[PDB]
Design a protein around this ligand. Sequence first.
Ligand code: CLA
Ligand SMILES: CCCCCC(=O)OC\C(C=C=C1C(C)(C)C[C@H](OC(C)=O)C[C@@]1(C)O)=C/C=C/C(C)=C/C=C/C=C(C)/C=C/C=C(\C)C(=O)C[C@@]12O[C@]1(C)C[C@@H](O)CC2(C)C
Ligand SMILES: CCCCCC(=O)OC\C(C=C=C1C(C)(C)C[C@H](OC(C)=O)C[C@@]1(C)O)=C/C=C/C(C)=C/C=C/C=C(C)/C=C/C=C(\C)C(=O)C[C@@]12O[C@]1(C)C[C@@H](O)CC2(C)C
Ligand code: KC2
Ligand SMILES: CC1=C(C#C/C(C)=C/C=C/C(C)=C/C=C/C=C(C)/C=C/C=C(C)/C=C/[C@@]23O[C@]2(C)C[C@@H](O)CC3(C)C)C(C)(C)C[C@H](O)C1
Lengths: 168, 176, 73, 87
Amino acid sequence: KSQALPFMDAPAPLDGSMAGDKGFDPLNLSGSFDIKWMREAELKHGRVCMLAWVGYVAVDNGFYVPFAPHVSSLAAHDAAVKAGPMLGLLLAVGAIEAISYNAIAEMMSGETDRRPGDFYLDPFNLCSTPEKLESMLEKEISHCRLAMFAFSGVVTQSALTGGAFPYT
Amino acid sequence: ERSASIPFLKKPPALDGSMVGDVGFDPLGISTTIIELGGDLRYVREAELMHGRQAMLATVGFVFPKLFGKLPVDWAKDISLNPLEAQYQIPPVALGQIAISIAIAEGLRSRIVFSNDPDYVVGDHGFGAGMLKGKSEAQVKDMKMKELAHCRLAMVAITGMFFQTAITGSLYPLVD
Amino acid sequence: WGIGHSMKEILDAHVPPKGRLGAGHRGLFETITDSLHMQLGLALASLGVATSLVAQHMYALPSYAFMAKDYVT
Amino acid sequence: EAADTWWGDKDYPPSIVLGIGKDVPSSIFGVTSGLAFAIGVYCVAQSNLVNILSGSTVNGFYVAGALLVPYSWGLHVAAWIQKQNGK
Ligand code: CLA
Ligand SMILES: CCCCCC(=O)OC\C(C=C=C1C(C)(C)C[C@H](OC(C)=O)C[C@@]1(C)O)=C/C=C/C(C)=C/C=C/C=C(C)/C=C/C=C(\C)C(=O)C[C@@]12O[C@]1(C)C[C@@H](O)CC2(C)C
Ligand SMILES: CCCCCC(=O)OC\C(C=C=C1C(C)(C)C[C@H](OC(C)=O)C[C@@]1(C)O)=C/C=C/C(C)=C/C=C/C=C(C)/C=C/C=C(\C)C(=O)C[C@@]12O[C@]1(C)C[C@@H](O)CC2(C)C
Ligand code: KC2
Ligand SMILES: CC1=C(C#C/C(C)=C/C=C/C(C)=C/C=C/C=C(C)/C=C/C=C(C)/C=C/[C@@]23O[C@]2(C)C[C@@H](O)CC3(C)C)C(C)(C)C[C@H](O)C1
């Protein structure tokens, strides 16, 4: 009954209802550990990869903010660590991830019905009807899976070559 | 069920409304571990209130000596900028009066706070009563909410000022 | 926050397979928490070992300058 | 409270003694036990085959990999627990 691997059936019954389900889990990690943590990690990785690909492209083009010495995105990490504001960005991320500590701890063990990677940062009601919510969830998770490979390729090509915008 | 401040977190069970500024912001659950000890939130609200009031007086006191000037009396050779470095040039023959006045005021306030009495509205020290007569509960609640908002804003502000003048030379938009 | 151990489960689990130590450490969590004399006894035993250790190590490996020459301290 | 974790009347502990890894099958536990043991022994061997120096040769990856040797003990114990439980 598996979809991606048609010689199997359902790598544990954990893969039955969530968005982006294609029965693809050959190493049975969906049934070995609770799948809510896996979906939280997947969505979180994909969102990080999306913003990381957007930032890596924009810094490599010329969008540079005030001050911020104009260097390529490969050396921008070291340049801004020696500059200083990378530590402040790390502090802000750490505060958000302390709130994420609270969110994930409430989500896994009862007493909160939060979806993995949910939050409630939905100002414009683009997921009011359940069908719209399902469609946006499918688009979000597909964008996650695409942007992981996209940013991985961008970083690898930028590191091995000298560096350009299309990365050869 | 869920808090009004952090929507993806559970509502703090101790913060059940009926208090000024109760927007359900307690991710650590400080108020949860206060009431299961059998205590209430009177003391922590009183601490927040005077922390904010001292913060407002502090925000005015950081900016006033350099933006406007000093006292017309003598001995005012302390540095106009760097209030944190102007603490140490104060003569003791003024620190004595300052310490005595704060000591008697906080002794009276300690008699007020630690007593036992249940009719004491938190923050109602009786110093300010010249403007709340003939007002409904909505006006008093709005006035206390403005006080609490100013409290939290001024505390964040003074933390900013102290961490700016110690690392950076001074505040950017107003000084230097 | 979900992660972490429960001290009751660790004590209740530690039973050797076939009656080598009896029922293991079952019920030790309830006895220690409800008896302040057992906690205090464990604390004094550990502290006595600790202060004997400091007695040995401060003459064996002195850390303060110009000791091991006063001899009276 | 907690869970009934006592197993003095049984020949094997229940699966709930593993906590967050109470549903991992025995084969994954054993394979990861062997892999963690091999990687950890290699990492600690990189401290005596090569003399660890004062700052020059410390190689924190070998330090983090050195924690897999006590982790490999827990994985092969959990492999036995899941095997007797049938998982
Ligand atoms: C195209 C990718 C994509 C898609 C389809 C979604 C879809 C969704 N997200 Mg989501 N998200 C994404 C990327 C995406 N996200 C990224 C990259 C992040 C990291 C910041 C997040 C963080 C996030 C949070 C924290 C939350 C959601 C939520 C939601 C749901 C409702 C909101 C909605 O309708 O968004 C529709 C999305 C779009 C129409 C995309 C618009 C394209 C924008 C304008 C591009 C902007 C790029 C810009 C340069 C970035 C600048 C960075 C700088 C400002 C820091 C929905 C399932 C909410 C949820 O699940 O609650 C119900 C929620 O709380 N998302
Ligand atoms: C002697 C009486 C008391 C006098 C003292 C006083 O003041 O009265 C007390 C009082 C009310 C009253 C009473 C009176 C009617 C007056 C008298 C009554 O007595 C009787 C018997 O009737 C008692 C009482 C209580 O009823 C009202 C006073 C209220 C006060 C004083 C409120 C200040 C907020 C400051 C804020 C929010 C600062 C924000 C600063 C902000 C938000 C910043 O961002 C600053 C900053 O961006 C800058 C600029 C540059 C940056 O680089 C750094 C940062 C980012 C940090
Ligand atoms: C890829 C490898 C293949 C072979 C290996 C392997 O897989 O066998 C696995 C296996 C048997 C098996 C199999 C089954 C699972 C039953 C079934 C498998 O079939 C399947 C898939 O079902 C086949 C088979 C035969 O494999 C048995 C595994 C046994 C194993 C893994 C036993 C570890 C002891 C660890 C100890 C005692 C640690 C002491 C650690 C010490 C003394 C220390 O920590 C010292 C320390 O200083 C350290 C080093 C670092 C410091 O920081 C901390 C300190 C200072 C304290
Ligand atoms: C955790 C402590 C802390 C708090 C709570 C806090 C709050 C606020 C608030 C809200 C009330 C505002 C609105 C605000 C605004 C600015 N801050 Mg903060 N700030 C804190 C710490 C620092 C440090 C360490 C520095 C700094 C600075 C600036 C600059 C200058 C930018 C520029 O010069 O353009 C501006 C505009 C830097 C500075 O001093 O100039 C380089 C600097 O080093 N701030 N800051
Ligand atoms: C509430 C809550 C949270 C929180 C919080 C936070 C952020 C709490 C912060 C509280 C905070 C930040 C409290 C500051 C007090 C500072 C004072 C009173 C300073 C007075 C300063 C004085 C009296 C200085 C006077 C000066 O005269 C001197 C000394 C020299 C003069 O030259 C200059 C002036 C006149 C200025 C969590 C932890 C995030 C989650 C939890 O779950 C819920």
